[PDB]
Write a protein that binds this ligand. Structure first.
Ligand SMILES: CC(C)(NC(=O)O[C@@H]1CN2CCC1CC2)c1csc(-c2ccc(F)c(O)c2)n1
Ligand SMILES: Nc1ncnc2c1ncn2[C@@H]1O[C@H](CSCC[C@H](N)C(=O)O)[C@@H](O)[C@H]1O
Length: 220
């Protein structure tokens, strides 16, 4: 109901991200000062599955969805995992990632340039599949199909993490960058509709009151 034709929905957002500077501040819509707050909370939220316990999550390989120039790949994933794959729809950001990442960018194993609605991660490949601030660009059915494909790419004890914006009441339409913001209910329905289990749900604090609410979901 909030998407009249899907072809124009994707084509408008892809054009939007072509004209965005490959800087950290451009990845977050002009909020690059919160990158340190985000990464550190994502670091804590990720130890829940990395520390000792019954079902320890591996550290062999990870997949960053959205990624951009590698803001999360550089600060969060590359320190913790041996190899990291990146996937994005904007080729410019992946090219600029080779510079932004630096010496450690040599451990980035693959750069995929295509949309999540068309991306199929290899099975039995990743210990962590990080999906941050990008789900608002997919349709409700493509997001469920994508999460269904990610489940088959997880290694034993692997997890899927979704950290994106959540609306307070209703679906908020942002035609500035061609994205939809959803509430916790529709997201959890889509998550459950892919056959995934809720393992943890945490809300990011220490955030400006102008941006949306941000929640993290741990799935497998
Ligand atoms: C940092 C954050 C969370 N700000 C925010 O709250 O939104 C703001 C409202 N307005 C749009 C996005 C900024 C600036 C202008 C942000 C930046 S870019 C982004 C996003 C976009 C599209 C997506 F599909 C997605 O998953 C995520 N979120
Ligand atoms: N339909 C789509 N399929 C795959 N990636 C998309 C997409 N629409 C937007 N993106 C990517 O999602 C990012 C939007 S915000 C980038 C957030 C980034 N993942 C981070 O580390 O914080 C852009 O890099 C854009 O190229």
């Amino acid at each position: 109901e909030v998407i009249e034709d899907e072809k124009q929905f994707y084509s408008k957002a892809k054009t939007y991200w072509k004209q965005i500077p490959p800087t950290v501040d451009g990845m977050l819509g002009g909020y690059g000062h919160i990158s340190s707050i985000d990464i550190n909370s994502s670091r804590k939220f990720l130890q829940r599955f990395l520390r000792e316990g019954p079902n320890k999550t591996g550290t062999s390989c990870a997949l960053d969805c959205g990624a951009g120039i590698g803001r999360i790949t550089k600060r969060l994933l590359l320190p913790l995992f041996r190899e990291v794959d990146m996937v994005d729809i904007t080729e410019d950001f992946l090219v600029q990632a080779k510079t932004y990442l630096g010496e450690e960018g040599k451990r980035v194993r693959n750069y995929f340039c295509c949309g999540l609605q068309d991306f199929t991660p290899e099975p039995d490949s990743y210990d962590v599949i990080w999906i941050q601030w990008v789900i608002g660009h997919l349709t409700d059915q493509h997001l469920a199909e994508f999460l269904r494909r990610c489940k088959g790419s997880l290694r034993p004890n692997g997890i899927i993490v979704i950290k994106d914006n959540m609306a307070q009441e209703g679906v908020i339409l942002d035609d500035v960058d061609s994205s939809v913001c959803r509430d916790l209910d529709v997201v959890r329905r889509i998550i459950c509709s892919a056959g995934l289990s809720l393992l943890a749900e945490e809300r990011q604090e220490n955030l400006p009151d102008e941006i949306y609410h941000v929640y993290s979901f741990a799935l497998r």
